[PDB]
Design an enzyme around this catalytic site. Structure first.
Site, PDB file in Angstrom:
ATOM      1  N   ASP A  21       0.817  -1.204   0.000  1.00 48.10           N
ATOM      2  CA  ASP A  21       0.000   0.000   0.000  1.00 48.10           C
ATOM      3  C   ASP A  21       0.857   1.262   0.000  1.00 48.10           C
ATOM      4  OD1 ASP A  21      -2.021   1.988   0.518  1.00 48.10           O
ATOM      5  OD2 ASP A  21      -3.262   0.381   1.355  1.00 48.10           O
TER       6      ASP A  21
HETATM    7  N1  LIG Z   1     -11.624   1.191  -2.391  1.00 48.76           N
HETATM    8  C1  LIG Z   1     -11.073   1.817  -1.323  1.00 48.76           C
HETATM    9  C2  LIG Z   1     -10.593   1.075  -0.252  1.00 48.76           C
HETATM   10  C3  LIG Z   1     -10.027   1.717   0.845  1.00 48.76           C
HETATM   11  C4  LIG Z   1      -9.934   3.105   0.866  1.00 48.76           C
HETATM   12  S1  LIG Z   1      -9.291   3.852   2.122  1.00 48.76           S
HETATM   13  O1  LIG Z   1      -9.514   3.059   3.299  1.00 48.76           O
HETATM   14  O2  LIG Z   1      -9.954   5.116   2.270  1.00 48.76           O
HETATM   15  N2  LIG Z   1      -7.790   4.045   1.920  1.00 48.76           N
HETATM   16  C5  LIG Z   1      -7.208   5.333   1.533  1.00 48.76           C
HETATM   17  C6  LIG Z   1      -6.831   6.230   2.699  1.00 48.76           C
HETATM   18  C7  LIG Z   1      -7.790   6.662   3.607  1.00 48.76           C
HETATM   19  C8  LIG Z   1      -7.434   7.483   4.669  1.00 48.76           C
HETATM   20  C9  LIG Z   1      -6.113   7.886   4.823  1.00 48.76           C
HETATM   21  C10 LIG Z   1      -5.150   7.463   3.915  1.00 48.76           C
HETATM   22  C11 LIG Z   1      -5.510   6.640   2.853  1.00 48.76           C
HETATM   23  C12 LIG Z   1      -6.876   2.907   2.052  1.00 48.76           C
HETATM   24  C13 LIG Z   1      -6.174   2.757   0.707  1.00 48.76           C
HETATM   25  N3  LIG Z   1      -4.765   2.686   1.040  1.00 48.76           N
HETATM   26  C14 LIG Z   1      -4.449   3.117   2.387  1.00 48.76           C
HETATM   27  C15 LIG Z   1      -5.795   3.185   3.103  1.00 48.76           C
HETATM   28  N4  LIG Z   1      -5.786   2.131   4.124  1.00 48.76           N
HETATM   29  C16 LIG Z   1      -5.480   0.770   3.681  1.00 48.76           C
HETATM   30  C17 LIG Z   1      -6.700  -0.042   3.285  1.00 48.76           C
HETATM   31  C18 LIG Z   1      -7.779  -0.176   4.151  1.00 48.76           C
HETATM   32  C19 LIG Z   1      -8.893  -0.917   3.778  1.00 48.76           C
HETATM   33  C20 LIG Z   1      -8.935  -1.525   2.529  1.00 48.76           C
HETATM   34  C21 LIG Z   1      -7.861  -1.391   1.657  1.00 48.76           C
HETATM   35  C22 LIG Z   1      -6.747  -0.648   2.034  1.00 48.76           C
HETATM   36  S2  LIG Z   1      -6.047   2.463   5.593  1.00 48.76           S
HETATM   37  O3  LIG Z   1      -6.349   1.263   6.318  1.00 48.76           O
HETATM   38  O4  LIG Z   1      -7.155   3.371   5.688  1.00 48.76           O
HETATM   39  C23 LIG Z   1      -4.760   3.126   6.268  1.00 48.76           C
HETATM   40  C24 LIG Z   1      -4.779   4.468   6.631  1.00 48.76           C
HETATM   41  C25 LIG Z   1      -3.663   5.047   7.225  1.00 48.76           C
HETATM   42  C26 LIG Z   1      -2.527   4.281   7.467  1.00 48.76           C
HETATM   43  N5  LIG Z   1      -1.440   4.846   8.048  1.00 48.76           N
HETATM   44  C27 LIG Z   1      -2.510   2.937   7.115  1.00 48.76           C
HETATM   45  C28 LIG Z   1      -3.626   2.359   6.518  1.00 48.76           C
HETATM   46  C29 LIG Z   1     -10.418   3.847  -0.206  1.00 48.76           C
HETATM   47  C30 LIG Z   1     -10.985   3.204  -1.302  1.00 48.76           C
END
Ligand SMILES: Nc1ccc(S(=O)(=O)N(Cc2ccccc2)[C@H]2CNC[C@@H]2N(Cc2ccccc2)S(=O)(=O)c2ccc(N)cc2)cc1
Lengths: 108, 111
Positions: B32
């Site tokens: 990620d």
């Molecule tokens: N389709 C889809 C799935 C998940 C997301 S997300 O959770 O919002 N999102 C983006 C994000 C949100 C908030 C802060 C930073 C990044 C994910 C995408 N990559 C990082 C982020 N995350 C990983 C994730 C979580 C669930 C499913 C898949 C991946 S996370 O868990 O929110 C995360 C946030 C901050 C840190 N330190 C680590 C992890 C968005 C769209």
């Protein structure tokens, strides 16, 4: 270009988003290899546009395809459907868009 | 190795994680680039723990490690030494953040 990976500096990019409900706007999006579907701020949609409901309230889903144009590539990225952030002005380029622009992840 | 990106294919990888409170274990972690800090399951840690409360963008889901974490990848022999990383308590995700990708000099290439 090669975007370095830094916990301090988010791998962002300036991208023009065409929601086909309003004029195309260039916004700062986050390059995310963990996100499957691209996220688009609701601030780029018109007040009229119907969106498919699908956290269940924080995000919605586009009814029309969205076109995305990067600073370098000329041809736009076509997304059949993408998430709509209705709260925090969130723009996130997921793998669905990163696939179309030949984007990869390299580990030495 | 060059890891291709696909919406219908999670960029997972096999990694050996040492929490330094139990036996080193192998887990499937999600590559990620949107994660600023690595997230590891609480199923890797022992029973006693001492883990700190934290707030992550939820006040209850994640916890913070008091001790560094040794992470080893298939290719490179030398481990990745995170000073600290998030601990998923609700579920049991495994997420390689940018804090880990930096030490192994990972990059995002866009043609
Ligand atoms: N389709 C889809 C799935 C998940 C997301 S997300 O959770 O919002 N999102 C983006 C994000 C949100 C908030 C802060 C930073 C990044 C994910 C995408 N990559 C990082 C982020 N995350 C990983 C994730 C979580 C669930 C499913 C898949 C991946 S996370 O868990 O929110 C995360 C946030 C901050 C840190 N330190 C680590 C992890 C968005 C769209």
């Amino acid at each position: 270009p090669v975007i370095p990976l830094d916990p301090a500096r988010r791998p962002v990019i300036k991208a023009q988003v065409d929601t086909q409900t309003s004029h195309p706007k260039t916004i700062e999006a986050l390059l995310d290899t963990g996100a499957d579907m691209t996220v688009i701020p609701i601030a780029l949609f018109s007040s009229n546009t119907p969106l498919k409901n699908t956290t269940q309230d924080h995000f919605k889903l586009t009814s029309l395809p969205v076109l995305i144009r990067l600073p370098f590539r000329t041809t736009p990225i076509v997304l059949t459907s993408c998430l709509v952030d209705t709260k925090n002005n969130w723009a996130i380029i997921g793998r669905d868009a990163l696939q179309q622009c030949q984007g990869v992840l390299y580990l030495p």
